């Protein structure tokens, strides 16, 4: 059991504040389309060895934001996330 890149149809949610020694190997944040890819909105992670799921309403996704912008490297895509940028 694992979820593939761009494949994020997750139906179950860690919901763990994620470690920000394993966050800075979290190389992209995938956003889980509630039609466009999956049934539900989630947002859920991708490190460089897996993903994981995390309720879109979540203080470590939000924090995270704050946190790739200062970590892997200063490599990122293009998320216009300025819905949320910590005010999620």
């Known amino acids: 059991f694992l979820l593939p890149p761009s494949t994020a149809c997750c ?5 763990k ?5 394993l966050l800075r190997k979290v190389i992209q944040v995938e956003l889980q389309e509630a039609d466009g890819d999956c049934h ?7 490190l460089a060895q897996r993903s994981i799921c995390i309720h ?9 934001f704050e946190h790739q912008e200062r970590k892997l ?10 819905m949320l940028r910590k005010m999620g």
């Open 73 to 82: 490297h200063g490599t990122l895509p293009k998320l216009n996330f300025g």
């Open 40 to 46: 539900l909105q989630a947002f859920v992670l991708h």
């Open 17 to 21: 504040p994620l470690s920000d020694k």
């Open 11 to 15: 139906t179950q949610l860690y919901r």
């Open 56 to 64: 879109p309403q979540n203080p470590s996704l939000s924090q995270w």
